[PDB]
Amino acid sequence: TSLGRSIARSMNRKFHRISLGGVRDEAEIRGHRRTYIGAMPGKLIHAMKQVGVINPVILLDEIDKMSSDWRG
Amino acid sequence: DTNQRESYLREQMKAIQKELGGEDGLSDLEALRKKIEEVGMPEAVKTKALKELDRLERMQQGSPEATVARTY
Amino acid sequence: DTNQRESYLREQMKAIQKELGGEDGLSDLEALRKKIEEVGMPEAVKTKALKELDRLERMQQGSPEATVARTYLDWLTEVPWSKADPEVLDINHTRQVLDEDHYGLKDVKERILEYLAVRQLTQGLDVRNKAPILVLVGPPGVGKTSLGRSIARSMNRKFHRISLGGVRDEAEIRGHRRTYIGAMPGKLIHAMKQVGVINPVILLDEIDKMSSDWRGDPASAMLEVLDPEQNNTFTDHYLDVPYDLSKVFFITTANTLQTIPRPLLDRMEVIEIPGYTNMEKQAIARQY
Amino acid sequence: DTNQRESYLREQMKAIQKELGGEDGLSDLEALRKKIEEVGMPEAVKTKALKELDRLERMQQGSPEATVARTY
Amino acid sequence: DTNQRESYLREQMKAIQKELGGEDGLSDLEALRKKIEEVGMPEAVKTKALKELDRLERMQQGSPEATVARTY
Amino acid sequence: LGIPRYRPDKAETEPQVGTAQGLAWTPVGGTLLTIEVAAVPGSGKLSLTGQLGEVMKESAQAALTYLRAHTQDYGLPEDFYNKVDLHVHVPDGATPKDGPSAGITMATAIASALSRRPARMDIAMTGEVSLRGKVMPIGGVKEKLLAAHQAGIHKIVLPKDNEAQLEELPKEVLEGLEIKLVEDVGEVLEYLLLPEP
Amino acid sequence: LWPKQVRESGMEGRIEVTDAAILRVISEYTREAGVRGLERELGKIARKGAKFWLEGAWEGLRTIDASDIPTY
Ligand SMILES: Nc1ncnc2c1ncn2[C@@H]1O[C@H](COP(=O)(O)OP(=O)(O)OP(O)(O)=S)[C@@H](O)[C@H]1O
């Protein structure tokens, strides 16, 4: 956490440790499927909102035990 | 009667989420038109912002495609 | 009267479709329905395209069909039907191209020149189709993309690569049961989509690492595409009209000469590529 | 008002969708039938051919209800 | 009267599956049911048969409650 | 780069007593199945160790039949075979290439035990043994060759009887090699140990 | 087999074959107790014939000989 905070502030960027490990689908990562109900923002896009620029530093937290409900 | 009272009961849930419900997708509704101009001048993010500009305009609690456009 | 009737029908379904969906499913419905026409289509693909549009126009804002049928329309348009590059049937052009590709075990090259010396001769449509698949066998990391792409640029087609490291189902050689969202075709179809023709060349890598223990057996499903009269009749569970896939040149990297299936150990010529020598690899790096 | 207008416009787009789905799909089940009576089938064989003709008349563009009957 | 009562409700709901809803496999389970009630079986057979008739009348897509029940 | 993940050269890798360079052709890459056997006075029961299957055990007995024909080559008494219980580990004890292409390598591991003297490393062997103790031609010659030279191995052992395949080899490969050719199991096993007894 | 395999690999049969080689082919080049590997060796006849008659032709109308069996 403090590691990545020091990374982005060392690069004068905005660190956002985001919840990607333990997402039920590609739903906080790739966003839930469109044209209908059941969607939430991607945590990558949470961080991309949360940075103000074209060039951030973004954590992808605890990718060791990844699983997803989309067939993919 | 169980099915249709369930339907009208969640319809009153939507209506109280709309008239006296300030905490809804209408909470971020002003932030949307407030921040459409802070989307970037490159075509990649500008085009998707303008295509979500009209897809969002429906009801943010009951309409299916309006919630994914709202969150996106 | 009748042509104004049909014109009003088409324009009104288009208009009220755009007015109520998400700009026709994020502009994508009209994007694909005009991307149908810029691609040359077979007529069954036009009928199926309208069906994909139908399973999409029943709901472009409700059921997963609003997305899966939309992606199905994307698959039909993205894969360019009736589209072939003006390839070049040639031999010494290829000899000099495998000269500019670095040294090589070079035994392989005469098997290649052997095959293509047959592929200039005249029986049939282009050349009569009785040949092995010319299977590459060996390790990873040797030039099974290098000389593969070198042969690709030597005859001027669309190179790509599709590893097959343990596909469990026909559902990744076909599609999954495309009635739900999440159903997607195989990566083979992803590649064939990604190249801008009907008739590219290919590397098929890592077939000996495949695993099949369910009802859908991919080994049968890759008999369904390796055999030449079959890929023009092959269809996904995702797709419904077979793709014009039969005019193909096709090399294949397996990595075991044993665990590959015996109904695919026919029609093959053992191209033994082991590792290179020291000196070969040193100059490979040193000037490429 | 929002739900009734959503449902009624959903109703016409479903109905004229069924119109268009009937308009664009033709001359394939008739190919099945003229393949039935071109084959010198016995009476039990023909009445099972009629059985899977009645197993048609369902949704067919990507649906399992009658497409497997069509291939059958 | 009670067994015939549950049976009258049985062919009523089998009829409901018989006009529409995949036409009950053109009354596929009905042949099993009428063959249950025609051929004179023991009563443990008949009880498990009637409770499997209840266990029937479901989805028919490689499921344990209809296909192996048809075999059964 | 970083710390060298392997040795600088496979020209010297400490030639041990009982290391047998297994020139198999694995699925993913070409490996050196450096299998081991160690000699001990025992009971004669050939120990089926290290995941042996059907043809590996009889290949081992094929080795010991040839050794029993040729005990003087490997420092062996006349009745040593009734008092040795030899143990072995086979990484990929089930065969990757589904063949005893390391058959003479298994024989090498056995005799490299039974000499208690160095079977030299760094020069890697392949081939099938015979009941008459002969090196039978091996399908897929060049794969074993350049598996060895992929591991940088200069000197490769292959059947004499495949001198036929030797000329079809590319003329940019053997220049970094030398392929000493053997028709029987004796001379392959005699070369790859400098102190054969 | 030579009319078969020579006609099936694109070639008209423009170049021809003797039999004092084909006895050496079946004795020295396919030691199977069937005929399929003879068909394979005749495939490689067609292959090397197409090459050495197409990468530069020392003759235009040739015939393969038992003195050049290793050559072919
Ligand atoms: N022998 C070679 N000579 C020249 N370039 C080579 C050679 N081998 C590989 N390359 C180059 O390196 C790329 C890939 O290198 P490789 O290590 O061969 O990876 P790879 O071949 O794709 O792995 P395999 O062997 O195909 S499963 C090729 O696309 C070439 O650009």
Residue numbers in the entry:
A (entry chain E): 362 to 433
B (entry chain E), D (entry chain C), E (entry chain B): 218 to 289
C (entry chain D): 218 to 505
F (entry chain D): 578 to 774
G (entry chain C): 506 to 577
The authors write:
The Lon protease is a AAA+ protein found in prokaryotes, archaea, and eukaryotic organelles. Lon is involved in cellular protein homeostasis by degrading damaged or misfolded abnormal proteins, which prevents these unwanted protein species from forming toxic aggregates. Lon is known to form a homohexamer; each protomer is composed of multiple domains, including an N-terminal substrate-binding globular domain (NGD), a long-helix domain (LH), a three-helix bundle (3H), a AAA+ ATPase module, and a protease domain. We show here, using cryo-electron microscopy (cryo-EM), that the activation process of the Lon AAA+ protease may involve a pentameric assembly and a substrate-dependent incorporation of the sixth protomer to form the substrate-pore-loop contacts seen in the translocating state.
To study the structure in the substrate-free state with ATPγS, we first set out to identify MtaLon with a point mutation in the N-terminal LH domain to eliminate substrate binding while preserving the native sequence of the AAA+ and the protease domains. Using a fluorescence polarization (FP) assay, we found that MtaLon-Y224S, which carries a mutation of the entry-gate residue Tyr224 to Ser19, does not interact with fluorescein isothiocyanate (FITC)-labeled casein. We conducted cryo-EM analysis on MtaLon-Y224S incubated with 5 mM of ATPγS (MtaLon-Y224S:ATPγS). Unexpectedly, both MtaLon-Y224S:ATPγS and wild-type MtaLon, whether with ADP or lacking nucleotide, predominantly formed left-handed spiral pentamers or spiral hexamers, rather than closed-ring hexamers. Surprisingly, the pentameric form consistently emerged as the most prevalent class. The pentameric assembly forms a left-handed open-spiral structure. The open-spiral pentamer forms a large gap between the protomers Ob1 and Ob5. The pentamer forms a tensegrity helix triangle (THT), consisting of three overlapping LHs from Ob1, Ob3, and Ob5, forming an interlocked, letter A-shaped structure that tethers together five protomers.
